[PDB]
Amino acid sequence: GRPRTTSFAE
Amino acid sequence: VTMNEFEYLKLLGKGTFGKVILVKEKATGRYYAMKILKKEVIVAKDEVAHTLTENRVLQNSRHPFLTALKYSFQTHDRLCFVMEYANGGELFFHLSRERVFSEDRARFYGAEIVSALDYLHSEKNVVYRDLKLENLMLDKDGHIKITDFGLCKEGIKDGATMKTFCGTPEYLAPEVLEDNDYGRAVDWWGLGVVMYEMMCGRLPFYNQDHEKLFELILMEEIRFPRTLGPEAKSLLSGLLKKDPKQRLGGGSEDAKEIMQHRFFAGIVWQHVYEKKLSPPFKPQVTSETDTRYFDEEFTAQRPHFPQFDYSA
Ligand SMILES: CCc1c[nH]c2ncnc(N3CC[C@](N)(CNC(=O)c4ccc(F)cc4F)C3)c12
Ligand SMILES: [Mn+2]
């Protein structure tokens, strides 16, 4: 199980 | 409808811009998920246009595997979306525990996801852009719900292109990392990464460090564990082509090219839509306030926005 990811926008 | 129309029960998620809470509407006894954002924070973090986008996409869309919006409303300090509650939790929750899904079970979720994305692209002219385990939940019966529409691109008709660097680093398509204009086929890259995680138990490109991860995405071919069947391999190969012109789904036929693929030969797409296919997993909840499929860290725990407000 991988860590939770984070969405983003530049 | 205001904060007083509801009782607040459990925290389901909390992520910088705000929180998600299981609520009950006083007037109806119905349970919903409430996304509550602080106006101050949304404004300060530049999240305004993403909030309006999610509000339009949710209002404009009606699909069995897309989260339905009941109300949007604001206060002096808050914006609130009251949405259908997915009691089965995130796919990320399930796959963290089970490690991998059987090919049949990954197929069932893949088909529902394809049905929703074909709808977004073909009926709504929307590219979703942030497909991932965290934004894929299960409702009470076991069907997919897509959540979180803030990164969508609207007004995207057929092959038209876009430029925004956004998404989730672990899922970014190579044409996006190339700083190229890109079309709706990025959604099929995301599907490929999600299908890959489901059937293989890991991301197809992985480094903790986003920039090293970007180098793998652009350079390396995916590995295929020896347990993958030949139709699964062909599907993953096709959806994870790095040139979107060569990707499965990357032509004018869009989702119809994936629907025809031999990995989905068993599937009757009209019955996927009509929800006539038996989910492989039914959430075993006792109650409605039973949040067994949500993480314990959570459940244990200024302008006017013109024409934000909405009721279904
Ligand atoms: C808000 C999406 C949603 C609709 N229906 C739901 N039913 C149950 N849970 C939901 N959750 C729980 C956590 C979630 N799976 C992922 N989103 C977030 O965690 C999140 C996103 C933005 C934000 F500001 C705060 C958050 F917690 C949504 C839903
Ligand atoms: Mn990360």
- Distance in Å, CA B137 to ligand 2 centroid: 20
Q: Which of B127, B138, B133 is nearest to B67 (CA)?
A: B138
Given an 8 Å threshold on Cβ–Cβ distance, is B170 in contact with A5? yes
Contact present, B277 and B112 (Cβ < 8 Å):
no
Would you list the DSSP string of B70-115? EEEEE-SSEEEEEEE--TT-BHHHHHHHHS---HHHHHHHHHHHHH
Amino acid letter for position B67: T
State how far residue A4 is from chain B, nearest Cα, in angstroms: 8
Distance from C-alpha of B179 to C-alpha of B189, rounded to nearest angstrom: 16
Cα→Cα distances B81→B90, B106, B120, B292, Å: 18, 30, 20, 23
- Distance in Å, CA B225 to ligand 1 centroid: 32
Distance from C-alpha of A6 to C-alpha of B15, rounded to nearest angstrom: 9
State how far residue B166 is from chain A, nearest Cα, in angstroms: 4
Domains and CATH numbers, chain B: 1-89+285-308 (3.30.200.20), 90-284 (1.10.510.10)
- Distance in Å, CA B13 to ligand 1 centroid: 6
Closest partner CB to B167 (pick from A1, A2, A7): A7
Instruction: Give me the residues paired with residue B94 across strands.
Output: none
Contact present, B100 and B49 (Cβ < 8 Å):
no
Radius of gyration of chain A (CA): 9
Question: Residue B152 class from Cβ within 10 Å (0-12 exposed, 13-18 middle, 19+ buried)?
Answer: buried
Distance from C-alpha of B182 to C-alpha of B162, rounded to nearest angstrom: 5
Tokens of B68: 């339905």
Minimal Cα distance from A9: which residue of B? B166
Within 8 A of B166 by CB-CB distance, chain A residues are 7-10
DSSP3 helix / strand / coil % (chain A, rounded to 5): 0, 20, 80
Show the beta-strand stretches assigned E in chain B: 6-14, 18-25, 31-38, 69-74, 78-84, 136-138, 144-146, 166-167, 310-311
Q: Which of B118, B100, B112, B83 is nearest to B13 (CA)?
A: B83
Radius of gyration of chain B (CA): 19
Q: Which residues contact B155 (CB under 8 A, 6 or more apart)?
A: B125
Distance from C-alpha of B188 to C-alpha of B207, rounded to nearest angstrom: 22
Q: Which are the catalytic amino acids of B?
A: 130
b vs e for B216-250, b when ≥16 Cβ sit within 10 Å of the residue's Cβ? ebeeeebeeeeebeebbeebbebbbbbebeebbbb
Distance from C-alpha of B261 to C-alpha of B244, rounded to nearest angstrom: 17
> Phi and psi dihedrals of B267, rounded to 5?
-95, 135
Given an 8 Å threshold on Cβ–Cβ distance, is A5 in contact with B202? no
